[PDB]
Amino acid sequence: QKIPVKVVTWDEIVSLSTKLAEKIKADEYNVNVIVAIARGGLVPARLVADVLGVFDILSIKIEHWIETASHTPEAKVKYPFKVDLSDKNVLIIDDITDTGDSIELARKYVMENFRPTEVKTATLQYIKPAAKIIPDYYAEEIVSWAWFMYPWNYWEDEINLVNKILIERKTKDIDINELKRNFVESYGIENPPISLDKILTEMKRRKIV
Amino acid sequence: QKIPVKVVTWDEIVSLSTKLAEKIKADEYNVNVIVAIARGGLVPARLVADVLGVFDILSIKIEHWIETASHTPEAKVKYPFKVDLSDKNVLIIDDITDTGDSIELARKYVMENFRPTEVKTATLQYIKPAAKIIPDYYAEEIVSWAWFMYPWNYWEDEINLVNKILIERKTKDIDINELKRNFVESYGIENPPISLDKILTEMKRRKIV
Ligand SMILES: Nc1ncnc2c1ncn2[C@@H]1O[C@H](COP(=O)(O)OP(=O)(O)O)[C@@H](O)[C@H]1O
Ligand SMILES: Nc1ncnc2c1ncn2[C@@H]1O[C@H](COP(=O)(O)OP(=O)(O)O)[C@@H](O)[C@H]1O
Numbered sequence: 222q223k224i225p226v227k228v229v230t231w232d233e234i235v236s237l238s239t240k241l242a243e244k245i246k247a248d249e250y251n252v253n254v255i256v257a258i259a260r261g262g263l264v265p266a267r268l269v270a271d272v273l274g275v276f277d278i279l280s281i282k283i284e285h286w287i288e289t290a291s292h293t294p295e296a297k298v299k300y301p302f303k304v305d306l307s308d309k310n311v312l313i314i315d316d317i318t319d320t321g322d323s324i325e326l327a328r329k330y331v332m333e334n335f336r337p338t339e340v341k342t343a344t345l346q347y348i349k350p351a352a353k354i355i356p357d358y359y360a361e362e363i364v365s366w367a368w369f370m371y372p373w374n375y376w377e378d379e380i381n382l383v384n385k386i387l388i389e390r391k392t393k394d395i396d397i398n399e400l401k402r403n404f405v406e407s408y409g410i411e412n413p414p415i416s417l418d419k420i421l422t423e424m425k426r427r428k429i430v
Numbered sequence: 431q432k433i434p435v436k437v438v439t440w441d442e443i444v445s446l447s448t449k450l451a452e453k454i455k456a457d458e459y460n461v462n463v464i465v466a467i468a469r470g471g472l473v474p475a476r477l478v479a480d481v482l483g484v485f486d487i488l489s490i491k492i493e494h495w496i497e498t499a500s501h502t503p504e505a506k507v508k509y510p511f512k513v514d515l516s517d518k519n520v521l522i523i524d525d526i527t528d529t530g531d532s533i534e535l536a537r538k539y540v541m542e543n544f545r546p547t548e549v550k551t552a553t554l555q556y557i558k559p560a561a562k563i564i565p566d567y568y569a570e571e572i573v574s575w576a577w578f579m580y581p582w583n584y585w586e587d588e589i590n591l592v593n594k595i596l597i598e599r600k601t602k603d604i605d606i607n608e609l610k611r612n613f614v615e616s617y618g619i620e621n622p623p624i625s626l627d628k629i630l631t632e633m634k635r636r637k638i639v
Binding site: 231232235246257259260263264266267268270271272274276277278279280282299300301302303304305306372373374375376377426427 | 440441444455466468469472473475476477479480481483485486487488489491508509510511512513514515581582583584585586635636
């Protein structure tokens with residue numbers, strides 16, 4: 222209920238995606254197809270593709286489930302398909318390597334269903350202490366876990382962060398100022414990229430409040 | 431000869447994606463799945479998804495071919511697959527509606543192979559004079575054709591724009607300053623987002639010069 226949060230800007234996204242692409246250039250891995258993990262990897266994938274000169278980008282949606290009693294986590298490809306990717310070199314891309322569960326599944330899935338010559342994985346960020354698996358490439362190493370708010374995720378992240386606060390509330394009527402206070406106290410954010418009243422209005426429409 | 435080029439910033443991308451999402455909210459179209467047209471629609475798709483609250487994003491790669499003698503254009507899905515999307519409402523997303531050839535194909539493809547309850551199309555921008563088809567939703571109407579440099583496309587676009595200049599060199603050469611003045615002369619860009627020497631270095635590595 223008190224969470225380290227880092228707001229990531231577009232400029233940083235560009236800077237990261239570019240640095241990630243540089244490593245891949247320098248390693249001279251010739252990428253024929255990029256497989257983006259949706260939704261997190263879509264944006265980083267397009268950027269890396271721009272820098273490297275990759276024209277074929279495909280994507281697979283990975284869901285993240287938890288079993289209520291056991292707290293067992295299971296990553297799972299939603300809407301699975303197969304394509305013939307032989308004689309092609311695949312680069313899989315995601316936003317961040319946190320646990321490594323998703324890039325583990327993706328590599329495995331891609332190798333069984335797409336049948337590429339080679340597969341390498343790449344994420345913008347990589348959390349050393351938390352990652353069971355290390356991606357072939359990453360732009361930035363994180364030695365201390367935090368939640369990273371990406372510029373393409375601001376709405377959803379803020380909705381969740383706000384909700385964590387509202388489910389412990391004096392209740393029902395929402396003082397925007399108390400909320401703003403709590404957001405600073407809990408996450409360290411004085412100035413959310415999306416203003417909190419816009420967030421609240423949206424949570425209402427999505428009837429979460 | 432001159433090409434009208436407009437450089438589009440991330441802030442504008444955000445502003446557009448958001449406005450596009452607002453239209454869709456206001457029309458009360460309940461989107462279950464977003465199908466992004468790769469590569470152009472990937473980024474806009476992630477953003478619209480953030481704003482609307484859509485969790486499932488799939489993508490199909492559309493290629494664009496021209497036959498050399500007839501100048502006949504043909505859009506074509508590369509790496510086709512099928513998934514069962516029945517009882518779902520699909521939103522297809524691309525960056526811009528220029529000719530309409532790609533969103534025409536995507537709509538037709540998605541309805542034949544995915545079998546959704548309903549399909550609607552949406553792009554950030556829409557060029558009135560050029561579009562044979564009009565997307566269900568768009569953020570911005572363009573009444574005068576130009577080429578839009580998107581922030582996820584800066585490298586590739588500049589590589590091409592530079593190459594259009596280099597293939598009419600007077601001599602085997604490449605004075606960076608000549609290039610810079612030609613770029614202003616031809617496209618109206620004094621300050622390309624990626625500096626032109628970086629572009630040249632990259633064209634060399636890609637064996638284009
Ligand atoms: N610390 C974090 N900051 C931002 N997003 C995260 C973080 N941890 C997980 N996520 C989101 O959850 C998804 C799955 O996480 P995980 O299964 O650990 O991925 P990976 O296999 O890349 O480590 C990521 O693609 C990302 O969108
Ligand atoms: N004026 C333009 N500015 C930027 N990109 C363009 C333009 N026209 C075409 N493109 C690129 O070419 C792709 C295909 O164009 P087109 O077949 O006309 O698409 P649509 O079916 O969306 O009109 C687009 O997704 C876009 O990436």
